Design a protein around this ligand. Structure first.
Ligand code: FAD
Ligand code: FAD
Ligand code: SAM
Ligand code: SAM
Ligand code: SAM
Ligand code: SAM
Lengths: 553, 553
């Protein structure tokens, strides 16, 4: 049993580590994840666990399902695997079937959580598993060193934690923390209540700017000033960020293990090994494609680490974004699609709406408009004003020092290149006119068009990813941060279209004309993605759009 | 047994195919080869065979040894594996030990060859294996549809083939041919003699320009005019070459299998699957990193297909290069290293030697000096004249259409880039002066220096390959044809240094002063490799060399 070995390790004074992975968005991602499992197992982790993300039908039977990732790890790889579980908006028989399948599939360890929106708290699930399936499953539960964000207080949260662990459970996994002192405080507090189950500290290695930028938003974590200050100059050079994160992790882990109150370190891998492996090797616990820079939904899809961090349970919708402010931003009600066009335009121009409220966000892009779109702002306003609703773009760039404050990245002393591209929704009429016009730009312009119905039109290769950003650096291969890939793009459509009726539509009633307008847009508008391959020349995307309008109008 | 299944396939009218691989030069090459084996096995090849190359100690115990490649294929992969064998300059007990090990290792099939320079002909080996190891091993033998190059005639060669197959053997593998008619002629001729063992036709898919260029040299094969003519315009665009080769292979194989006299097709893979897989899928026999463009010793070392084609047994030293002409070219005798410098200079300038003979070749570079060195000829003459003996180089190039007749390659409508680099030998004194001078070019210049003793000095990353040539093409990832890699470079030194005393030294007697000069050079001269990373600027390699000379002189 897991608890048994953990106690037969604690009593011997052995220190162990564990690794947390999340189901890859894509099948070849699953294959690469399994390869990662095999390679990391040589370190001798006590157990791995697979995150349970409610959004992506976790209890399904596809090769992406967390269930099957865990099942493959435990059967084929032999690694101890804990399957996470959530309760929010789940019915009794669904949970029952899931646990039955897990029993059949051999998921001997179930990690019980509550998730986020016949079960309300995590205590209810632990109690369901203990009542029905007996003591087959080993149950651990989440603990929070500073207090769950929405708890009334840290003391009542500790009381509820006691209640949970007393019902069932076997050990507590503790959310990431930046200083060992707080974890010691938490351990002592639990000790006073007499929580006998071991508490395992969560270690989050900062790996690239994206992780930091997401993490800083989480208020209660209170990222120390030092980390932000040091990173900020380095911000562009992710590799340096990773090194600093490794240094921080080693320091924190050394301080923890110095005390001996820590049975073992729980590392959130984010499906990226090198960082965690280096940290473990520095501590010395390591027993003994290289895609480690996901670049959100743009980088290599086949990478197991592919995926926007905001989809990770830790940063899933924490940016509350109150619905009343969204309603006041994008207009209380819409008279016609012209209103939608206006909203898209203001998001880029920045002038206040007629009601005086600036449109600060859109359903798709949450992050602030980067400083590269200053080179496209006028043309973007042009296209958006004329019904071409851009949701992403970048200018074509020739060789430029990697130290350029606007467009530079990567190891200093390199040269960085970009291909112009344009992601935008359009009316079916505009889409067809765009298809006709492109015929004369076929050689130099790559385009993907897809409807919510799934109909897809593309001239790019069926499965070859079109490289769009790359850099030349001394003594190193060619880095390709940004990619346009039909596979990543094709399923991305489902998210992009869903956002129309999920984030914007819900703001309006079911019979309101605004809802009808949004539904019309969601049903008919195409999703389009254009790339200009002639990067050493002037950006023709403006010209092709202009001739599309001239043909249509 | 292999013969058994082949006959139980022939009698049923089943058609089968086989795949031939060669031991990769590098360990990760072996791993990738094993992956290729696993993936190709889904086609259901009857048997694979592993080439036996005498040069690279084939009967060794490293992970590159053909023996162990075969052993891993048969044990771990389960694929029927034939181990090739050679006789030239091998002793009785070495062969005996090799076969004993094979028996222990489970290499149930031994392919008996003669190789090239107590055994003289392949008949002696087949007879040794049949005498000592009984009928455990299944023996096939090479046959030649047009006649072995050095045979007296095709009829006496056929008689000797009969003799060989009568002693032992079980089937004949036939060297590549371009037209099925000749194979039919060979089959009929053998039939008249009553060769009862099945004859398996060798299929060579042309995959890239390098293969064609090597193959055309082999006279007896007599490459049809059509292939050369069609390829020549395409020559630069390898992918198109591969497509044409696939078409040719499909046509030839269809014509063969139409007759029914062919039990099965034997494909020389060259450790590259896509081409062979496509051909098989076209025929329909397929049961059901992507590095497929080796670029000789420059491309990705980890690729199983890495390696100069001239090392392949088929094109191993066929370019006789008579020793008397080498002696008359590079000087009958040498008075000092100045003579070597003169030879190196003339190789690039092209003026006739004082004796009137033009220096057409050097031990290292056999291929004619490409048309890109016209952009460096004056500086190359400078450096060579001043004791910097270049054996490779390329100019730094910014964006240039891929259709450029001089430097273009790859899919049309791309942009091609190059980093300047310089491979050259130097005196130890010049080497140290170069090391001192480089300190001020450390940021932009990457350098590797290594001696025959193995001492190595480098500022590049320990194992990261420095990319030196790349191209930007529509709707495609960044292609990296040419790489500078410490791993490939580090063992390459052994070949480069060995050539000094093997190809040049042997021309002079053991006590001759010329031999002493060549030995001095081979012992003391460093092997150097410089790369200029600032490709959008003027080539500084000339400047750094000039300041190296200024410091020294
Ligand atoms: C290691 C770890 C892994 C995680 N994995 C995932 C994952 O895979 N998927 C995912 O969606 N989320 C995951 N989370 C996040 C977690 O699911 C959310 O924080 C969730 O909202 C809280 O679940 P819980 O287990 O704390 O349940 P609970 O403790 O029941 O809920 C937390 C809140 O409920 C309160 N509470 C608990 N019991 C009572 C009670 N009896 N009366 C009143 N209030 C009570 C607590 O005070 C606290 O405010 C993970 C968190 C951690 C630390
Ligand atoms: C399918 C295939 C695979 C190969 N694999 C390899 C490999 O892994 N490594 C490698 O180094 N080479 C390889 N070769 C090349 C081969 O080893 C060379 O061509 C070699 O020089 C000839 O060997 P052989 O088997 O024909 O032996 P032999 O037939 O003994 O030698 C060929 C020559 O000997 C003559 N000869 C044969 N018997 C007699 C006799 N009794 N009296 C007089 N003359 C005789 C023939 O007429 C012919 O001219 C391969 C060739 C083929 C077709
Ligand atoms: C992931 S980036 C694409 C650029 C690419 N990653 C690179 O290496 O430069 C997202 C970019 O899309 C641009 N852009 C984002 N949202 C846009 C919108 N609604 N309309 C027009 N342009 C937008 C922003 O400049 C933002 O920096
Ligand atoms: C999104 S791009 C550049 C975006 C935009 N052009 C800018 O600089 O503001 C930067 C990406 O390059 C990738 N990157 C990849 N390898 C890197 C490396 N060795 N060093 C630094 N960044 C790297 C990371 O995914 C990283 O997110
Ligand atoms: C494999 S290429 C290197 C260029 C690279 N492959 C590219 O993509 O352009 C070999 C080149 O080395 C150059 N060069 C070769 N031998 C040389 C020699 N002895 N001295 C100076 N330059 C040489 C020739 O131009 C030849 O084309
Ligand atoms: C050696 S380089 C260019 C040499 C030199 N610059 C010239 O053009 O004469 C060409 C290499 O690019 C690689 N190449 C790789 N991928 C290719 C592709 N899709 N199409 C064409 N060539 C490719 C091949 O290894 C091929 O040998």
């Amino acid at each position: 049993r897991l608890r048994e070995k953990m106690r037969r390790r604690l009593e011997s004074g052995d220190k162990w580590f564990s690794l947390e992975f999340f189901p890859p968005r894509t099948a070849e991602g699953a294959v690469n994840l399994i390869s990662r499992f095999d390679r990391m197992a040589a370190g001798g982790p006590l157990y791995i666990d697979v995150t349970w993300h409610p959004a992506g039908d976790p209890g399904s039977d596809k090769e992406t399902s967390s269930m099957m990732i865990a099942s493959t790890a435990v059967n084929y790889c032999g690694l101890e695997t804990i399957l996470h579980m959530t309760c929010c908006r789940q019915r009794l028989e669904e949970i029952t079937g899931h646990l039955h399948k897990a029993k059949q599939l051999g998921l001997k360890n179930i990690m019980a959580l509550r998730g986020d929106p016949g079960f309300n708290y995590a205590v209810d699930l632990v109690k369901h598993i203990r009542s029905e399936f007996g003591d087959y499953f080993d149950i651990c539960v989440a603990g929070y060193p500073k207090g769950h964000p929405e708890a009334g207080s840290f003391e009542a949260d500790l009381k509820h934690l006691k209640e949970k662990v007393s019902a069932g459970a076997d050990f507590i996994i503790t959310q990431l923390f930046f200083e060992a002192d707080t974890f010691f405080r938490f351990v002592k507090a639990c000790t006073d209540m007499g929580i006998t189950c071991p508490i395992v500290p969560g270690i989050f290695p900062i790996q690239g700017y994206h992780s930091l930028r997401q993490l800083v938003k989480l208020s209660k974590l209170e990222v120390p000033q030092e980390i932000k200050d040091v990173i900020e100059p380095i911000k562009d050079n992710d590799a340096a960020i990773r090194n600093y994160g490794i240094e921080l992790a080693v320091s924190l882990c050394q301080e923890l293990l110095a005390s001996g109150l820590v049975p073992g370190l729980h590392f959130y891998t984010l499906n990226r090994e090198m960082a965690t492996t280096e940290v473990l090797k520095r501590l010395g616990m390591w027993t003994e494609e290289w895609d480690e820079f996901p670049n959100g939904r743009w980088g290599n899809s086949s990478s197991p680490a592919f995926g926007e961090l905001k989809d990770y349970y830790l940063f899933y919708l924490k940016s509350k974004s109150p619905k009343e402010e969204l309603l006041k931003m994008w207009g209380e009600e819409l008279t016609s699609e012209a209103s939608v066009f206006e909203v898209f335009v203001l998001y880029l121009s920045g002038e206040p709406n007629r009601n005086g409220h600036k449109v600060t966000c859109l359903p798709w892009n949450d992050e602030p408009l980067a400083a590269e779109t200053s080179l496209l702002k006028e043309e973007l306003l042009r296209v958006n004003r004329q019904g071409i609703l851009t949701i992403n773009s970048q200018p074509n760039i020739n060789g430029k020092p990697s130290s350029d404050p606007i467009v530079g990245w990567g190891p200093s002393g390199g040269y960085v290149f970009q291909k112009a591209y344009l992601e935008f929704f359009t009316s079916r009429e505009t889409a067809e006119a765009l298809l006709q016009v492109l015929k004369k730009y076929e050689l130099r312009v790559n385009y993907h068009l897809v409807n919510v119905k799934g109909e897809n039109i593309t001239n790019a290769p069926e499965l070859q990813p079109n490289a769009v950003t790359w850099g030349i650096f001394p003594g190193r291969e060619i880095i390709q941060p940004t990619v346009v890939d039909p596979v990543s793009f094709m399923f991305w459509k489902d998210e992009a279209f869903a956002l129309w009726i999920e984030q914007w539509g819900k703001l309006y009633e079911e019979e309101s004309p605004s809802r009808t307008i949004i539904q019309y847009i969601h049903d008919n508008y195409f999703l389009v993605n254009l790339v200009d391959n002639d990067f050493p020349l002037d950006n023709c995307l403006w010209q092709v759009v202009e001739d599309t309008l001239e043909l249509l109008n």
